[PDB]
Amino acid sequence: DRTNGGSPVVHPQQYHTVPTAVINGAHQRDRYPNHSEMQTLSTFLRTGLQRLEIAQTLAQHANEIVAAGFQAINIADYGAVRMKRSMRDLGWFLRYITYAVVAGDTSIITVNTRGLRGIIPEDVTVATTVALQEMQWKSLSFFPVDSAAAALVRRYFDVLIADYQVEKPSDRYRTGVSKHDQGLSFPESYEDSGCAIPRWVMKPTLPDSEKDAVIRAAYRQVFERDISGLGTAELTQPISQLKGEDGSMELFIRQLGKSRLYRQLFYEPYMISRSIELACRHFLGRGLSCMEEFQRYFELVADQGFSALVDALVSSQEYADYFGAETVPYIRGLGIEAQACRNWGPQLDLFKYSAPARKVPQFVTAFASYRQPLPNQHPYGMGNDPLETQFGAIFPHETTNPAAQPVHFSEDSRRILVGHAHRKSHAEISQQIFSLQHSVESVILAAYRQVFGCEVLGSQRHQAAETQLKGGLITVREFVRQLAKSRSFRQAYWENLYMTKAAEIIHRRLLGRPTYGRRETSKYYDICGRQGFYALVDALIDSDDYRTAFGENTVPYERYVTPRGLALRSPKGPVAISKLRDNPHTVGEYMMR
Amino acid sequence: RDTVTSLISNYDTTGRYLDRDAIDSLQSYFITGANRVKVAAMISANAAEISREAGKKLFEVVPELIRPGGNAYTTRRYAACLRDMDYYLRYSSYALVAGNNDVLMERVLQGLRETYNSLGVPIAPTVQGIQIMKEMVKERASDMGVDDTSFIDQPFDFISREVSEIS
Amino acid sequence: MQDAITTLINTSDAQGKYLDDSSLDTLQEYFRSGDLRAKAAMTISANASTIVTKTVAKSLLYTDITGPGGNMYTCRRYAACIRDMDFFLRYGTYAMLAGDASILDERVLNGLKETYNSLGVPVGATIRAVQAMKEVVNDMLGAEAGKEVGYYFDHICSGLS
Amino acid sequence: QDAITTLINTSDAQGKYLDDSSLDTLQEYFRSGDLRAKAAMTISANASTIVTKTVAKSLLYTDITGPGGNMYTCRRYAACIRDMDFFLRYGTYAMLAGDASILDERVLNGLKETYNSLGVPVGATIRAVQAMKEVVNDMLGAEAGKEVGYYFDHICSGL
Amino acid sequence: MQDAITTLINTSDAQGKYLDDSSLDTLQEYFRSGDLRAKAAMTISANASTIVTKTVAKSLLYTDITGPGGNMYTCRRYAACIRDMDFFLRYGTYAMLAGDASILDERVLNGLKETYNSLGVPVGATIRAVQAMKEVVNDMLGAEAGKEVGYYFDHICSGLS
Amino acid sequence: MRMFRVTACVPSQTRIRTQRELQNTYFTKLVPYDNWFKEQQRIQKMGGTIVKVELATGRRGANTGLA
Amino acid sequence: SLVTELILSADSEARYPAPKELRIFQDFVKTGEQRVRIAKALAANEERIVQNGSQKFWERCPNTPSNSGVDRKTASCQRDQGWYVRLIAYSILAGSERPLEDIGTVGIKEMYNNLEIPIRNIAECMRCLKEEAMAVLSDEDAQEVAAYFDLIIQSL
Amino acid sequence: SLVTELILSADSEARYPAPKELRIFQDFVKTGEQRVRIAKALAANEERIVQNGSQKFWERCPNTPSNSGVDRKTASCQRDQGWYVRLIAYSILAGSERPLEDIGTVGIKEMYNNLEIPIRNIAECMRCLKEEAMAVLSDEDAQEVAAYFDLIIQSL
Numbered sequence A: 001d002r003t004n005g006g007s008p009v010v011h012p013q014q015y016h017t018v019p020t021a022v023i024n025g026a027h028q029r030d031r032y033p034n035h036s037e038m039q040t041l042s043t044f045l046r047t048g049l050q051r052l053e054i055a056q057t058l059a060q061h062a063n064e065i066v067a068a069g070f071q072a073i074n075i076a077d078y079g080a081v082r083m084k085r086s087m088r089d090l091g092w093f094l095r096y097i098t099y100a101v102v103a104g105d106t107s108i109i110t111v112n113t114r115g116l117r118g119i120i121p122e123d124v125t126v127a128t129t130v131a132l133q134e135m136q137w138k139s140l141s142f143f144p145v146d147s148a149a150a151a152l153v154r155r156y157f158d159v160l161i162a163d164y165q166v167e168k169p170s171d172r173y174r175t176g177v178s179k180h181d182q183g184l185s186f187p188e189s190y191e192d193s194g195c196a197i198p199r200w201v202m203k204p205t206l207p208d209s210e211k212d213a214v215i216r217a218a219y220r221q222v223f224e225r226d227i228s229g230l231g232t233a234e235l236t237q238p239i240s241q242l243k244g245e246d247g248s249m250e251l252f253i254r255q256l257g258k259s260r261l262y263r264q265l266f267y268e269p270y271m272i273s274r275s276i277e278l279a280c281r282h283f284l285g286r287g288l289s290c291m292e293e294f295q296r297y298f299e300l301v302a303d304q305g306f307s308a309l310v311d312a313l314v315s316s317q318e319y320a321d322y323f324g325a326e327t328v329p330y331i332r333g334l335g336i337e338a339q340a341c342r343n344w345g346p347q348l349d350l351f352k353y354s355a356p357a358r359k360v361p362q363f364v365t366a367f368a369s370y371r372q373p374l375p376n377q378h379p380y381g382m383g384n385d386p387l388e389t390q391f392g393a394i395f396p397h398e399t400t401n402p403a404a405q406p407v408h409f410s411e412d413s414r415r416i417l418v419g420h421a422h423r424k425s426h427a428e429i430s431q432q433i434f435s436l437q438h439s440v441e442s443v444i445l446a447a448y449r450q451v452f453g454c455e456v457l458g459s460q461r462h463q464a465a466e467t468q469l470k471g472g473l474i475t476v477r478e479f480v481r482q483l484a485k486s487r488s489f490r491q492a493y494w495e496n497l498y499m500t501k502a503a504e505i506i507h508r509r510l511l512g513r514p515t516y517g518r519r520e521t522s523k524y525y526d527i528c529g530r531q532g533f534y535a536l537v538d539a540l541i542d543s544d545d546y547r548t549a550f551g552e553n554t555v556p557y558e559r560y561v562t563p564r565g566l567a568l569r570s571p572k573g574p575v576a577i578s579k580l581r582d583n584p585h586t587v588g589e590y591m592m593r
Numbered sequence B: 001r002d003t004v005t006s007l008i009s010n011y012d013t014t015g016r017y018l019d020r021d022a023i024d025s026l027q028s029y030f031i032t033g034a035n036r037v038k039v040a041a042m043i044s045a046n047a048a049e050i051s052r053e054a055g056k057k058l059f060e061v062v063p064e065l066i067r068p069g070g071n072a073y074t075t076r077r078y079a080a081c082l083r084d085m086d087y088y089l090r091y092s093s094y095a096l097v098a099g100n101n102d103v104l105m106e107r108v109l110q111g112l113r114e115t116y117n118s119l120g121v122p123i124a125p126t127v128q129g130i131q132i133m134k135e136m137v138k139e140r141a142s143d144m145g146v147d148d149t150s151f152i153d154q155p156f157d158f159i160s161r162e163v164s165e166i167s
Numbered sequence C, E: 001m002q003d004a005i006t007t008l009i010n011t012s013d014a015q016g017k018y019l020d021d022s023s024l025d026t027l028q029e030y031f032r033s034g035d036l037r038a039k040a041a042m043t044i045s046a047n048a049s050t051i052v053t054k055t056v057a058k059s060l061l062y063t064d065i066t067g068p069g070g071n072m073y074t075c076r077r078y079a080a081c082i083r084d085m086d087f088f089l090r091y092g093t094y095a096m097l098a099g100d101a102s103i104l105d106e107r108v109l110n111g112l113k114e115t116y117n118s119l120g121v122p123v124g125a126t127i128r129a130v131q132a133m134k135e136v137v138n139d140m141l142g143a144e145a146g147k148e149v150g151y152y153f154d155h156i157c158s159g160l161s
Numbered sequence D: 001q002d003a004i005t006t007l008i009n010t011s012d013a014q015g016k017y018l019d020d021s022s023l024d025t026l027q028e029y030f031r032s033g034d035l036r037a038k039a040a041m042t043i044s045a046n047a048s049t050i051v052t053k054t055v056a057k058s059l060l061y062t063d064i065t066g067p068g069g070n071m072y073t074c075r076r077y078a079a080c081i082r083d084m085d086f087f088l089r090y091g092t093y094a095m096l097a098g099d100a101s102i103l104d105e106r107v108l109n110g111l112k113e114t115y116n117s118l119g120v121p122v123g124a125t126i127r128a129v130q131a132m133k134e135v136v137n138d139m140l141g142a143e144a145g146k147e148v149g150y151y152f153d154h155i156c157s158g159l
Numbered sequence F: 001m002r003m004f005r006v007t008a009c010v011p012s013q014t015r016i017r018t019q020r021e022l023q024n025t026y027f028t029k030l031v032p033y034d035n036w037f038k039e040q041q042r043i044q045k046m047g048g049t050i051v052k053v054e055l056a057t058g059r060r061g062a063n064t065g066l067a
Numbered sequence G, H: 001s002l003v004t005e006l007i008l009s010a011d012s013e014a015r016y017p018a019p020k021e022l023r024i025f026q027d028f029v030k031t032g033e034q035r036v037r038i039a040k041a042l043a044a045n046e047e048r049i050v051q052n053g054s055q056k057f058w059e060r061c062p063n064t065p066s067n068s069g070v071d072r073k074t075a076s077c078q079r080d081q082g083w084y085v086r087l088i089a090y091s092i093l094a095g096s097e098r099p100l101e102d103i104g105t106v107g108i109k110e111m112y113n114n115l116e117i118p119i120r121n122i123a124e125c126m127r128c129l130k131e132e133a134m135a136v137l138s139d140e141d142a143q144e145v146a147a148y149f150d151l152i153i154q155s156l
């Protein structure tokens, strides 16, 4: 019903362990973990003995812990479901304490507990904190409290009680930046679960290494990677103006954007629209929110160049609202702020490091074609549509230059195909038919040029079928089936091909027309997947469409194409779409009356 | 685009002036606008109750979502689901004011299925909770005194239809 | 359809010489892992339906991806998911036996992401199903052949993710 | 996602306390963690030398460094070196995590499309990464080299 | 496809008139170049394989494109190149005898750049080879008919480019 | 190119910064001429008191050569 | 045009134009002078050919929408006759009936049924126009033009 | 390779490989040591099988473009003989004629007819290299190489 922006694989972080946080920090700094991060990992793995045995004893005595766990409530007055949820919550809290102990971080507790004050009905919060305190007392009662890790269990229970005592924490807000931009809200649990992103702020009195760290993060934001090791980052005047008391991080972002390094990376190999999307990534930390934002950017580039677009992005209200003056732009993804569903696919394909690997501009295609009806496309995306030439299964690769526009067609949806029957005439399409073009030999050759769009070598000749048809033992339909069951046909159209692409190209060669919808394509794919290649060839030759169109004594021929096929078959444009205006009069040349 | 601007844009794209059918439809929308504003007011006064109680009713009828396998188990995911409920209620109220689903088209259905398939969010509990929200706003509108509950029926049904699958 | 032998021949043939000593060591490695690859493929052939039953049992059932409005609802869709899982098992086996995943790359992973995004098939869910299949084969085969076939199962997941 | 995250994810998905087999898997991770960390440190102090030796033994004096090859045109050579450093450091990240999730989320997704769009040979990349596995094996020891070659082999799996 | 008479007729029909005087002398130019166009087509048809032989011998042979790692290594790739050259020369004959480049538009240059970039067929070397074919056919048909067929060969080269 | 040395303090009135979103507001910044109009308008839109605007680079009354 | 039929005949079986196709080609490229003269004559006397065809057509079969008193319908009929004999000139120049087919006689039947004009009335008018083309042209030129007029007659 | 033929035969019928196919696989991976030995021997004596092949191929049929006085053509003939014995070694290692066919013997005829070298003289030279491969290899190895040399003789 509507075109798809892509559903990429996302892994939302529910919490942080100790190793995940350290690796997140080292990764977000683009470096090997250093000696203190090394000491983090090694010290936590050293305490792992005590942590695992704490979790062992707590899981072993969980039944008695939650059995032991203000005005005590009545079972009958509270309700059976509410009593069940009280016991479930209590066992759940103990489980998450053991989870935190093994993970070495209270991030799971703090994320999953801090905003629970009113989720639990808040008239039983005194009962809740008394029960949690009694669980703390009992867990320490059978875990000896002199100087052991019972201090650790006390601290983790205290952190759980402290998180639960925190009242209503305000949801974070990604406010709409324009009339076309929707505002979004964001729970603080989702904010605290999200991966910590370093906020590189450059102040004039920072030490040199901290400044160089901020410069390196600026390179990683803008140029997508660290270029400082290379001699291409020779920008000694911008760096030097940036380091001391002047030329702040915003001016430096602009200087990085207008540099020819940025043009070589993200403007020279791209058309304007893809370049605009990448600039949105590199200067605001987010993709295009809406079509109208892209209209503003595209018109601005059209009359003033791309450097003015960089100037407008870093001079925008949103830039000063998020990154201010001396904060490096950072990527605003899943847990950093609230995400919109509008650009979910394009923006998650843009935040990925393989965003320059795509040339076709993902945002504008999705945003425009959502406000348009369904496109003329094979039901399993446009990569399944081969190139309408005489021969050769030429499909768009999913990896090499991904130009993918996924679209959901219904099962009953049918493709519009441009037939050659209504077009042209008769005795114009009966020159490409080759029934029984009366010589047998010509019919063998034309059956080849249908089955393999060009004449084949002698090793690819199916000479036994030639002798059979010259003797009248088999008819044209059986010969075409034998050619389509030859080994070289399998190599040409079945082995080195995606299976539904293989089925579609065999359908185009054996039927002379693309498939219509998921009925046909689903049936062929199911046949060739549960039964195989020769079964699909037999089912396509014995298909009722083959019998109605090509019968038994007629070589298959192309009958229908995609409209893209005719657009390829008219590079000068179509014949007569509206009467031309040869020798016209325009104002200005007329006004000089 | 509300009903007015959508109908005007359609006639602009075909080049016609306003015929009497458009004048009748515009006057009908302008008459229903008092009820639409009343429902928007009740919604703005009871939105947290409506969205949260719909989430609670959904988790009672679909029990698995708060169970450990479900994609609303922890309170992080629970709060995310309730915030989604508030999202649906707010944009359905926007569409109720406008009388048109363009707001839903560009700001609710613009990739919701892609997000819910990326995160593993189940589609059908989401539309079941949307229907619980619709029945809730229907019943407190009927108690408030609005006989015509037809207007408040449409945005939740549109979100459900565009989000749900084909059986 | 390229295999470890044919990849070795093609890298030697693009440079224009005979296969060298390190390539011959890689060839010996394939020639001596062939027996366990054949035994693993025979076991997979015997127990493929049991694998797919177990795989869907531990990963795709009793989540609301299976209930009404799921992608596994509307029984033809369940049969479609089972048929796809069979295809991943068979093609991971084909890649395992031949030594290289060229069959995966050319028959499955080229356009399956576009197809699954077009149908609305949840890609993370089918990645989870592939690694559940990987764990099932790990459980009923052992480590060595298990990690050898889980290599190409993880290749399938990489082509999906 | 490290090994602790994947283990607690399984346990919380089935809704129980950490089971004895799960605790045993955590035990293997936690008491192999010291050799993992040591390997991480010496992989950090000797990453440049490893990349040098691996380019020397796998990617040099083949016709991909020659004219018309993929490691002609010195900036492409520097990009090749940086890709090798990324692979080394992210295999290190996975080694410290105990899980290949950082690989699946930051390297292997995005890599095949990038390499096929740029025209980078996948086979030369995998032979370079396996040379990396051998070099880290030789300079580390069999156990640490195997534990990091598991993640190097995961990277080669995604290619 | 279209020819010179057809495209003149279609432009005049789009204007809604008969063949005007300018299209008339254009049609006279066609109707007096016809005999030499037919003789040039006959001479090309007599020596198509020899033209492809000289073309490949002067443009593609003794380069890295034919050695190992080149596009014309692995003999069936050489045959595919030779058959593409047969197509280029035959369709250039079609466009020369027709008097319009329309047949090259609907049967050669449509999707051909996309096809060659998909296969890794180098397009600049193909342009070099088609212009070598232009020199070969210019050699023994003469300048004039050679210039006429080289016009359509240059159109082929522009379409590849 | 001619530069403006601008000191201004731009306050936030629409958002509460939690602990990290707080950056600074009192910035002294070299501003290019071709953007200073838009920066003045932007920091007037957000509500900043502009206390110091001087011409860091270039002279006054330049008919040419100012960039 | 017959050149296009020769090329599509040389094409679609993957072969260079045979000597016989070149023989028909030289015959056509030498008859081109006569074709040009026929087309010039037809363009010269188109107006009176249409008027005399309308004269015989309204005399013989007067129960048509053209002579129902409305001047716009008969203006359309006049222009249609002129367009058809112009297509006859086009097919004369092109040496084959393909211009006639692709411009006026492929979807002719459903065209006139949408315009509600009876088919046999158009066939009668085309018989009249064929007779006018006979009366103003020499015998060879009459045969050349009458072949395409018969092509229209079959098409209705 | 034999493995690729077993996988593609298991494919196209949508079924896992049979016990017979995997049995052939075990036999082949056992024979791989002998096949590596044959490949090493061919790679060791490539120079001298090419030299002696040229010797007797010029002693039998001198009416070839090879010995026509151009030493570049002799170099090309030597290189072609070396490439084809290398392809035979590839078929030995692969165990199927797939490297011999796909690189060498699909477009033999179009390539060598475009090159103007007559086909059957190359057939004679390949017989010459077959006799040398007899002369230098042990009997089982000679038969294994002979299978692909006879495939080459079929190809031309």
Ligand SMILES: *[C@@H](C)[C@H]1/C(=C/c2[nH]c(/C=C3N=C(/C=C4\NC(=O)C(CC)=C4C)C(C)=C\3CCC(=O)O)c(CCC(=O)O)c2C)NC(=O)[C@@H]1C
Pocket (backbone or CB within 6 Å): A012, A013, A184, A186, A190, A334, A337, A338, A339, A340, A341, A342, B065, B070, B071, B072, B076, B077, B078, B080, B081, B082, B084, B085, B087, B088, B091, B107, B108, B112, B115, B119, B121, B122, B123, B125, B126, B129
């Ligand atoms: C109850 C509703 C179901 C449920 C919800 C759930 N959703 C998410 C995460 C997100 N939800 C959205 C939604 C929107 N963004 C928009 O712009 C719009 C229109 C205004 C909508 C509806 C988004 C983008 C996300 C991503 C996170 C974010 O906040 O930006 C989650 C959390 C996912 C996770 O595991 O991290 C949940 C739990 N879950 C259920 O089980 C119910 C069926």
Ligand SMILES: *[C@H](C)[C@H]1/C(=C/c2[nH]c(/C=C3N=C(/C=C4\NC(=O)C(CC)=C4C)C(C)=C\3CCC(=O)O)c(CCC(=O)O)c2C)NC(=O)[C@@H]1C
Pocket (backbone or CB within 6 Å): A271, A272, A273, A274, A294, A295, A298, A299, A364
């Ligand atoms: C004019 C000849 C035809 C025409 C044009 C038309 N285009 C748009 C909209 C866009 N055009 C583009 C184009 C480009 N992006 C690039 O990067 C490049 C630079 C080389 C080009 C040429 C884009 C991205 C858009 C969208 C942004 C924008 O609208 O400016 C429209 C408007 C479409 C709409 O729905 O608003 C139009 C009308 N239309 C015709 O009918 C002419 C034949």
Ligand SMILES: *[C@H](C)[C@H]1/C(=C/c2[nH]c(/C=C3N=C(/C=C4\NC(=O)C(CC)=C4C)C(C)=C\3CCC(=O)O)c(CCC(=O)O)c2C)NC(=O)[C@@H]1C
Pocket (backbone or CB within 6 Å): C060, C061, C062, C063, C066, C067, C072, C073, C074, C075, C078
């Ligand atoms: C009862 C008549 C028989 C029976 C039932 C049984 N079924 C399952 C498990 C499942 N059954 C379904 C059913 C459907 N999905 C659909 O789309 C349709 C049509 C709308 C149907 C009927 C599904 C999806 C499952 C999977 C479990 C789930 O929901 O996650 C079981 C359990 C088997 C197990 O181990 O999971 C059983 C027992 N058993 C009998 O004896 C009867 C013959």
Ligand SMILES: *[C@H](C)[C@H]1/C(=C/c2[nH]c(/C=C3N=C(/C=C4\NC(=O)C(CC)=C4C)C(C)=C\3CCC(=O)O)c(CCC(=O)O)c2C)NC(=O)[C@@H]1C
Pocket (backbone or CB within 6 Å): A380, A498, A499, A500, A501, A518, A521, A522, A525, C060, C065, C071, C072, C076, C077, C078, C080, C081, C082, C084, C085, C087, C088, C107, C108, C112, C115, C119, C121, C122, C125, C126, C129
């Ligand atoms: C199952 C584990 C998951 C799942 C699957 C699912 N898939 C489909 C439909 C299709 N799957 C394919 C896949 C392929 N095409 C190929 O050529 C190959 C073999 C190499 C594969 C794997 C295709 C083409 C289809 C479309 C078939 C059709 O047109 O009917 C469905 C059904 C889609 C529908 O709406 O009917 C399903 C359910 N879904 C899950 O939830 C699992 C995680």
Ligand SMILES: *[C@H](C)[C@H]1/C(=C/c2[nH]c(/C=C3N=C(/C=C4\NC(=O)C(CC)=C4C)C(C)=C\3CCC(=O)O)c(CCC(=O)O)c2C)NC(=O)[C@@H]1C
Pocket (backbone or CB within 6 Å): D059, D060, D061, D062, D065, D066, D071, D072, D073, D074
């Ligand atoms: C000579 C002035 C100095 C010197 C040279 C030296 N070079 C190498 C090895 C290589 N040199 C290159 C160079 C390039 N490849 C390119 O694509 C470009 C752009 C045109 C350049 C400059 C490469 C890639 C290699 C590796 C070999 C290969 O091609 O695969 C060596 C050998 C180093 C080694 O360890 O073997 C040497 C010695 N040595 C000096 O002392 C001079 C200062």
Ligand SMILES: *[C@H](C)[C@H]1/C(=C/c2[nH]c(/C=C3N=C(/C=C4\NC(=O)C(CC)=C4C)C(C)=C\3CCC(=O)O)c(CCC(=O)O)c2C)NC(=O)[C@@H]1C
Pocket (backbone or CB within 6 Å): A225, A353, A354, D059, D064, D070, D071, D076, D077, D079, D080, D081, D083, D084, D086, D106, D107, D111, D114, D118, D120, D121, D124, D125, D128
């Ligand atoms: C080197 C051993 C092999 C090789 C490498 C090569 N890579 C590129 C270009 C890029 N590589 C990447 C990959 C990444 N960037 C990252 O940040 C990550 C880690 C998270 C990865 C995996 C990217 C994005 C690029 C694009 C441009 C860039 O240089 O960053 C090149 C240059 C390709 C070109 O034509 O520009 C090369 C040469 N190539 C080989 O042949 C070796 C096998």
Ligand SMILES: *[C@H](C)[C@H]1/C(=C/c2[nH]c(/C=C3N=C(/C=C4\NC(=O)C(CC)=C4C)C(C)=C\3CCC(=O)O)c(CCC(=O)O)c2C)NC(=O)[C@@H]1C
Pocket (backbone or CB within 6 Å): A389, A390, A391, A392, A393, A453, A454, E060, E065, E071, E072, E076, E077, E078, E080, E081, E082, E084, E085, E087, E107, E108, E109, E110, E112, E115, E119, E121, E122, E125, E126, E129
């Ligand atoms: C020869 C001068 C150059 C060259 C050629 C080459 N081509 C192929 C493969 C194909 N060529 C085509 C071409 C066409 N299909 C059509 O319908 C038409 C007219 C529109 C043409 C010209 C196709 C489709 C293929 C693929 C299928 C087939 O081979 O029949 C190859 C083989 C490459 C491969 O990997 O298959 C080659 C080598 N190579 C050169 O170096 C020359 C510059």
Ligand SMILES: *[C@H](C)[C@H]1/C(=C/c2[nH]c(/C=C3N=C(/C=C4\NC(=O)C(CC)=C4C)C(C)=C\3CCC(=O)O)c(CCC(=O)O)c2C)NC(=O)[C@@H]1C
Pocket (backbone or CB within 6 Å): E057, E060, E061, E062, E063, E066, E067, E072, E073, E074, E075, E078, H064, H065, H066, H072, H073, H074, H076, H077, H078, H080, H081, H083, H103, H104, H115, H117, H118, H121, H122, H123, H125
């Ligand atoms: C020698 C046994 C016979 C012979 C040889 C001969 N060959 C050439 C020229 C070439 N031979 C080839 C061959 C191949 N290209 C490939 O890709 C393959 C690999 C499977 C082969 C075998 C080619 C392409 C050429 C052209 C040069 C080049 O490689 O670029 C010649 C010279 C022809 C000339 O003058 O151009 C000769 C003499 N001649 C005989 O008489 C022997 C029977």
Ligand SMILES: CCC1=C(C)/C(=C/C2=NC(=C\c3[nH]c(/C=C4\NC(=O)C(C)=C4CC)c(C)c3CCC(=O)O)/C(CCC(=O)O)=C2C)NC1=O
Pocket (backbone or CB within 6 Å): A082, A085, A086, A089, A090, A092, A093, A096, A109, A112, A113, A116, A119, A120, A121, A124, A125, A127, A128, A131, B056, B059, B066, B073, B074, B075, B076, B078
């Ligand atoms: C830290 C682990 C964790 C916990 C314990 C948690 C709390 C939680 N309990 C919840 C709710 C309740 N807990 C309780 C009960 C308690 N929770 C307690 O810990 C104690 C001692 C009490 C008071 C008796 C009740 C009555 C509810 C009502 C649920 C409803 O409104 O329908 C919920 C809502 C989802 C659900 O119904 O399952 C959440 C999100 N969510 C988490 O992530």
Ligand SMILES: [Cl-]
Pocket (backbone or CB within 6 Å): A104, A105
């Ligand atoms: Cl701690």
